[PDB]
DNA sequence: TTTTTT
């Protein structure tokens, strides 16, 4: 119940996505990472506990409960999404510059463009 | 007790099935999905909790109890079932299209047909009408590749029949040859067909035509399982020969071949095989059995919008309407592909002598 | 204690057996079944809970206690048993048919025959009847493919005997060639047999005929274990084409009771051979070497009736590879694919079994129909 | 404490042993059983509970508490044992037969001989008799296959000696070829031997002759470990058509006490050779290289009696590959499959074993019967 | 707390050690043992419980508690120790024998030498006596195999210098026991296997003809810390058309470390202490001849035939034998019964004492390999104007090309000329 | 959470670091151990017990709680760090040598330099001295293998400049062909260098260029040898990636080098050092080791300073 | 993971 509520609150931030190949991508440190190379979902669960209310933060300091929240999260993800399809973009290490206005969206808006490759310098 | 009751109630909806090939299939999001690397049964248990009483639903929130329910369900499935047994049904990502009536089913009506494959895209019921300028404009590329003259009636009818055959989930007794020059309409037809049926389409090379099917892994033949159309696109200028035994083996309902690291050697053949040829083919051996399995569609109409509009999936639900119409036209009541052994120069002498 | 009592009661019913292959076989839904990667003991424990006292049945609703009962059961099984030792029993999904007499056993009577293979479908007593509208059509089809004339008597008898040998769980001493020209009905027979016997039928590639059978993993040989019918199709023109000849040693290895070959990721190299091997062809076979041993293991059945379309009716009556020309039926493959003549053909096969398996059924060679054997026949 | 006492009492009966190959063997049902996929130690713990006091037997009905006893036992076994060191003992499911005495041992008498292999069936003392209705049939069949004539005297003795080598658990320095024309009884002898000795018999492929033996995993050579009989069949005439020669070095590695080769997913590369290797052939073998070392390891037994149907009776009388023509029997094949002549053939093998162990038994080559 | 105290007390006994590879070696039954598929630490914990207070021994009867102590012990082992650093110590199942001196150590006196391998059998003092009929029979057998004559003096000495199978150090040469059939080459192998037991290993021919990689190679991984490696049989490299011996494997089998790991293991490095002996009826043929390869090959020849009475005439009329004797059919069974194990061990120790003067090393014999004949003459004739035709006629003026034709053909063509005659 | 508080204080020591390879490095026994098997974080947790409050130390005696702390620590490491950054440091198996400065940062002052590859042997300063016989025992050697005489001046400068180059933790983009004949002393160089940098020195064959690349990471020197005359070839498409790699690639030959195809860009990445002046048991006995170490350090504050 | 496959 409480852990399911915590998993539901995390699921509302769209920080974890499922790809068609059969893997998960996690939005941590302002970048879309990949699983199958060290588990990153529990790292995200531990790093997001500040946004959750106070009674939902002390529960996430327990490694076993974080695994329960992870198991809950992996069950609510049923629809797959594609990665890096938008042809007019230029990712950077603070966001993704657009290709028409010259605008450079960062942070919350940069999460919409699910990109795994990048230029390599700040902006 | 209570978890066993939940598992029994879930099993009554027939949402989990055991297959002949040895896999589990689950009905999630208007599709049948295979249990091979992800825990789909627990996902189904979590999703289906809204069709349960208020006392059985507040208990499926615990991941530990969902595993118990899954374990109970796994012991209840003892008898396997057969899938993909409806040749006149077209599956999508959201339901099944009936090629006879034209009706579309999306939910509990779609799960009655156990289709494990799909086109890979969503169906649009608003552009599948007849009207609208899109369809009226699509009668300008087809009518240009194959004109509507009196000298081209038989060839165009054969072309339409061959294109219609890609909608049927059944075994075809002939392999078709698209014979023509460059930029004559063959690639446009290939791209339109790929857009219209999506993931039910496959491109191969020459390993299935010139080589031997057995004796080792053949990943390009086990990939043709339950797929409705296969294109042999890039023919080298014939080098290895056609090896008529291979084309004979590609006609039977069952095809022998195994993937890498696998022991399964049987595949179901529902594919319309079309070979794009620019030069006269040469066969290892020509006999009456080879004559009975070859058809030729010839492109003899020499010709930048028609390069990205097709790639943008613009003619996706317009070409599909034409395919359904031609499907209806050529089922009277059984559609059968017939050979044309006179349209091959190599078969000229063998007919008389 | 209580769970041990449940396990002991389950063991007394002899519903779990250990075979001399490492497998555990269970008796669920009137059939012996096993799965290497999906152990079925807990499924049997769940299914058998209605033959126990009501206090012992509730405890079996817990998945964790079923595992305990399974662990107790696995420690009770020490000795192995031999399976598939009755050649005159045809196993179905819901019972066993006795080919000697004709009765169907659908309970503990079918349990004593430890058959680990089956047709895959249930047996229907209302269609294994003989007189039916479907059976009359089957007689017409079979009579068209193999007419009952005086010049086709021996060929028709060999055809019937080869077809009826597919119901027997025993090692056969010959490989048969269904030889004929195009559109002579030698695939209709194959489809009819596949409909009749179901999962007791298998198709394999030509590599079992032309390649070495034990150079690494060979899934095309390990899939013939306990199968009663193996089909090969469309060998190439060995003469007017550059093709690999058959190999006389493979033919001799495909006749022995035990065949050597292993699957991928497996250490088991022995397979039981219970199969009738049929190769359907448009050309006569060509071998590496001809000797008396090879000429003793091969039989040939001829197909000489052409099923054509009105256009080719005149061209067919002139060709000398055909003895009769009949109009093609375009709605026949669909009827076979829907298993319309499944039980009529099963009844026909059982009747032929009765005719030919008295007292002992044994396949015999037909060396006179092979041109490659001509020279050795001259002397 | 209490489970430790149970484990200590179990280990005092010497019912569990650890072998030099790092493997666990358990004495169950009058047999030394071994399997790495079965829970044999817990099986023994469950089966041996009747020898324990009543306060301990009821403690062993829990699967969880049998695993504790199994762990306690596993921590107690440090030393290793040799096993399979008696060549004059034939093991069965329910005991061991003494080939030099003829006496069957059961219980703790068979436990002394640590045999980890067996025929796979139970020994019946009412059929191991020299006077049966089946013995006359078996002698008739064998005398038909190998006649007792003056012209056939060394061949028959070599046949008997080779067949009786399959009872000895020792390394043998010769390979034998059963050579003959079609329908001469070469497979009937193989089937009779397989019925007689059961699981001590193995059939393998020709890849152990014409290929390398230790390049990657090779179950075809790894399954011959501690087997007393290996059969190969259908040599593909390495003379006329395109073919691969046998390999002279492969023959020499098959006569060594140890054979190098490993199974799948296994680190064990040594196999102990106790096998008589027999190859059924219609043509004489052809080798890539001929050497004096190869000549010392080859023996040939010839089959020259034809079993034919009456229709083919006339044609067999003109073939020089045959010395006698006899009527074929179609019930023989099915009767052999039903293990009708199991114990009669076993008695014959033991009787010949006593005949050919004149102190020691040594297989000898026949170099004169090879065209090469 | 209490289990941590038990682990700490067990650690102070120095009965568990960690090696550089990462192995855990335990001191049990007066021997150092390591095994990745055997619970050795819990075995030691169960065995050592009698050296602990009474209140601590009761805690060690529970297998669940022994695993906690094992985990605690595994967490305190942070430093690696070097093992098998004494070449002149022969470990048995119950102690260590000093080869240079002859004293047998038992208990804590053998624990000082961290010998992690063993013969597998106990050392017997009453059989290491040199005064027994078994010794006379063994000496007769050895003298039959390798006669003590003047013409065999240099070959018998190389045969004796077998005694290298006792040294726990890297050997820089590979030896071929080359001979005709029935010459005693397998009898020596069986005697050595009986004498040294588990320090002897037999592998396949793929270590000489295949490529050594990082993949799972049990045939290489099973040679770790072994003092004798035998490879039996070698095909004829000309008439059979088989794979030749790769020259790069000869270099890698001489280095102190070899690359190869078992299945389901990450131990990629193996320590090389082995004498490599190959039993042959044919002399080796290599795919690439060079000066480094010719420095690592030695050949011992067997020229005594043991034959049955029928075959004595042909044996005496053969140029591959110098002596013909009668075969003994009971010797093979006696050797398998470990009858000459300790007599042969004593003989090997006596030979070991002879060839340490004070350092023993193996010398190659390049003149016994026909494959090396061309390179020796070129090396001793040439030293690294001069027309090609002049060089051709000068080099063919003395040598005959009836056998060395392709050799000079390849040397002139492939190896193109700053070369001056001596 | 007591265990989370314990894991907080262990991360405020920088004893566990995450690498871009996907693994962890642990500072245990005064060495940045980097292992993909065996539990190192639990070993560190048990060892760091004494630097923790009294109530926090009793909790770490349970393996079950140590594993929980390990899981907590592994869930808090999100950002990777790079190892082996400083180029002027010599990792010895006691610590780190600060080349351009003179002092050995012995045991704990060498944790900021996250070096993962060492010379494999200990280092001292009593024998690493600025004088004493061993300094002159090889003066004759280093002066007769390579003299100067104002005619072999630049040759010797390059000789003992590319020698000192095998002390730099930065890419040496140059392939100096050690020309000369036999017995000129290029094997004395070979044995003096194996006795200077230990496992930081690697040997190879002709295959590196004529046609041993995986195990060249942080390798500070390669000394390909035993080469036959080419007149395969140098395969000129190799130097493009060969010099693109923390090693000074030294090729010593007894013959003339012939490249596959010389262009206007090929003769800009090749150096040469000639030996126009054409021990063992004592040179392999590590008699100098630290003396040759000083010789290299001496040549380091030379030409390579302030840039090479 | 090893085998299988290259
Ligand atoms: N008794 C029958 N009456 C009418 N049509 C029939 C009959 N038997 C078979 N056919 C049809 O005849 C056609 C040819 O039969 P088929 O089994 O394919 O012969 P085939 O020899 O295998 N052809 P091929 O593989 O090229 O040699 C098929 O369309 C069958 O449905
Ligand atoms: N000193 C001996 N006295 C009597 N018999 C002996 C003696 N040494 C060896 N033998 C026997 O002689 C036979 C041949 O010896 P063996 O060890 O097989 O030589 P081999 O070289 O390995 N044979 P091969 O593999 O063909 O070259 C065996 O039966 C030995 O037991
Ligand atoms: Mg057909
Ligand atoms: Mg036979
Ligand atoms: Mg030998």
Author numbering:
A (entry chain E): 324 to 446
B (entry chain D): 324 to 561, 566 to 630, 653 to 702
C (entry chain C): 324 to 702
D (entry chain B): 324 to 695
E (entry chain A): 324 to 484, 486 to 708, 733 to 764, 774 to 779
F (entry chain F): 324 to 534, 543 to 562, 567 to 579, 596 to 629, 655 to 684
The authors write:
Helicase E5 is a multi-domain protein; its primer synthesis and DNA unwinding activity are required for genome uncoating and DNA replication of MPXV. MPXV E5 is encoded by the E5R gene, the mature protein is 785 amino acids (aa) in length. MPXV E5 belongs to the SF3 helicase superfamily, which normally forms hexamer and unwinds DNA with 3′- to 5′ polarity.
To this end, we constructed and purified one MPXV E5 protein (aa 322–785) with N-terminus truncated, which is termed as E5_∆N hereafter. Like the E5-ssDNA-AMPPNP complex, the 6-nt ssDNA fragment was captured by the SF3 helicase domains of monomers A to D in the E5_∆N-ssDNA-AMPPNP structure. Structural superposition shows that the conformations of the DNA and the four DNA-interacting SF3 helicase domains are virtually identical in the two complex structures, indicating that truncation of the N-terminus does not alter the DNA-binding mode by MPXV E5. Compared to the E5-ssDNA-AMPPNP structure, the overall resolution of the E5_∆N-ssDNA-AMPPNP structure is higher (2.67 Å). No AMPPNP was associated with the monomers D and F in the E5_∆N-ssDNA-AMPPNP structure; their ATP-interacting loops are disordered. In the E5_∆N-ssDNA-AMPPNP structure, only one C-Tail (of monomer A) was observed.
